[PDB]
Every structure is written in C-alpha cells, then in structure tokens.
Design a protein around this ligand. Structure first.
Ligand SMILES: O=c1ccn([C@@H]2O[C@H](COP(=O)(O)OP(=O)(O)O[C@H]3O[C@H](CO)[C@H](O)[C@H](O)[C@H]3O)[C@@H](O)[C@H]2O)c(=O)[nH]1
Ligand SMILES: O[C@@H]1[C@@H](O)[C@H](O[C@@H]2CO[C@@H](O)[C@H](O)[C@H]2O)OC[C@H]1O
Ligand SMILES: [Cl-]
Ligand SMILES: [Cl-]
Ligand SMILES: [Mn+2]
Length: 238
C-alpha cells in the first residue's frame, strides 16, 4: 500500500477548505487511496508562497508517505477516473491536465493538481523558493522535471473535458490573484532557479494543529516563512 501526502498550500481559504475536506476524502475513499491532508497555513505576513509551503509540507510529512499531491484548495475532481495513484517511474502524474482544466490549457501546464513520488521530488530538490505571489512556480517546476530526466504523465481515456472534469469555485474578484510585481520580480522569476529548493527553504513551524472536520482528521501546519530581502525583496511589495 502506497500512501499519499495531500499537501494544500493555504491562507485565508476557510470555506474552500470546508468543501475541500469532505469532497476529497469521499473521492479518494472510493478509489481506495490511503492519504492524509496537510493544510500548509502560511502565517508569516509575506506574499503567498505556494511552492515554499509545498517544500515545508514535504519535509514535515513522514516517511510513510511515498508520494505527495500538491493540491489547490478550490479545485475538486468530478470524474472518478482521475486516479490519484502512485506515479509511474516516468515522473510526476498531473491530474489537472490542460485538456481537462476549466481555465489553463497550455501544453506544459502542471498546476492545480500534481502527484510526485518522494524520490522524484527529492531528486529535483523540490520546488523553487523564489515565487512570492501568484504565478510561474509550477512552470519552473515543469523545467525541473525535464532537467531531472523525468516526464509528466496524465490519465488517458478521460471522457470529460474542460467544462466538466473539475469544479474550480474561484471568483477572481472574491479571491484575488496577487499579481503585483515589485523590484525586479518580473525578470528574476521568469528564469530557471538552480539555487533554491527543498534543501534550503527557510522557515519555522510555529504550531501543528490536529483538526477533525466532520470526523475527517486533517493536520494544520502553521508555517512562518522567512524572506531574504537581499535575494527576493518581492516577497513584500508594501
Ligand atoms: O492567498 C492564497 C492564494 C492561494 N492559495 C492557495 O493556492 C491555490 C492556488 O492559488 P489560486 O487558486 O489563487 O490560483 P489559480 O486559480 O490561478 O491556480 C493556478 O495558479 C497558481 C499560480 O500560482 C498555481 O500554479 C495553481 O496550482 C494553479 O492551479 C489556491 O487554490 C489555494 O489553495 C491560498 O490558499 N491563499
Ligand atoms: O503559475 C501558472 C501561471 O504562470 C500561468 O500563467 C499563464 C502564462 O501564459 C499565459 O498565456 C496564460 O494566459 C497564463 O495563464 O497560468 C497557470 C498558473 O498555474
Ligand atoms: Cl520559466
Ligand atoms: Cl499527456
Ligand atoms: Mn484557483
């Protein structure tokens, strides 16, 4: 039996989380996937850093989890044929493929829901830490996948399409995307990051909370990320 660490980078998405937990738990129980949900709550006051939270969650998750799912909290599978299985030796298994995602349709999109073996994640030194605020972190990770000699696989013979494979309950005016650029964020985050990753993410876990949501156990990690403003000053544009 494989076990999946279901990693949910998180800040101020409480109602999303209330829908997320019962839905994913039922969904995964139906296909027999053993798993645990880790809410990666970024409690520092820097801009949202999804990828660094993933790195922290990977470090925290015990050895029993031999793969991880990096998972948006607002993106729910509607098709039971989307198998959250242990990825093959080829590399990561991308569940929310561009032919299936309601919004993102470019070929190398690996955002939303991406399953990665422990060994492969380690092999790539996890995700880049330089992505403060919305965007690009998954795209650079795609390059990390190619550079590691791995490939992305996606489920075949899925019959649903872009409008009926996932619900993406995300109103752009309610949950705003932090797309601000300051300092030379534009230039720096558009290039491959060979310098940061799993092995040097800087952080403290202030608190671990064990939460039951209608009987389903879920772990909350209160994560205080560090920002080195000598390297990534765009962690805060205030
Ligand atoms: O202030 C935030 C911002 C994001 N999130 C979490 O991060 C996830 C992804 O963020 P968004 O939903 O705001 O962004 P998108 O809907 O545009 O999703 C896509 O854009 C992101 C770019 O950063 C990621 O690549 C993401 O996986 C990809 O599906 C959210 O679902 C949520 O789980 C928060 O919890 N709080
Ligand atoms: O992090 C990813 C974003 O970088 C990505 O942004 C896309 C970049 O190319 C543009 O043509 C697209 O319109 C734009 O969405 O979107 C997905 C996100 O995961
Ligand atoms: Cl890039
Ligand atoms: Cl494919
Ligand atoms: Mn979203």
């Amino acid at each position: 039996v494989h076990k999946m660490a279901l990693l949910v980078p998180f800040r101020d998405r409480f109602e999303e989380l209330l829908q997320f937990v019962p839905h994913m738990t039922a969904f995964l129980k139906r296909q027999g996937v053993a798993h645990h949900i880790f809410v990666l709550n970024q409690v520092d006051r820097f801009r949202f850093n999804r990828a660094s939270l993933i790195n922290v969650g990977f470090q925290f998750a015990s050895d029993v989890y031999d793969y991880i799912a990096m998972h948006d909290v607002d993106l729910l599978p509607l098709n039971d044929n989307l198998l959250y299985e242990y990825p093959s030796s080829l590399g990561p298994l991308h569940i929310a493929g561009p032919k299936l995602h309601p919004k993102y349709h470019y070929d190398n999109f690996v955002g939303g829901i991406l399953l990665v073996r422990r060994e492969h994640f380690k092999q790539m030194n996890g995700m880049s830490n330089q992505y403060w605020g919305w965007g690009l972190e998954n795209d650079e990770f795609f390059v990390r996948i190619r550079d590691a000699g791995l490939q992305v696989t996606r489920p075949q013979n899925i019959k649903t399409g872009t409008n009926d494979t996932f619900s993406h309950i995300h109103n752009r005016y309610h949950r705003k995307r932090d797309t601000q650029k300051c300092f030379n964020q534009k230039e720096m985050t558009r290039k491959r990051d060979h310098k940061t990753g799993l092995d040097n993410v800087k952080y403290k876990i202030l608190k671990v909370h064990e939460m039951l949501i209608d009987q389903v156990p879920v772990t909350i990690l209160n994560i205080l990320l560090d920002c080195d403003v000598n390297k990534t000053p765009w962690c805060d544009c205030s």
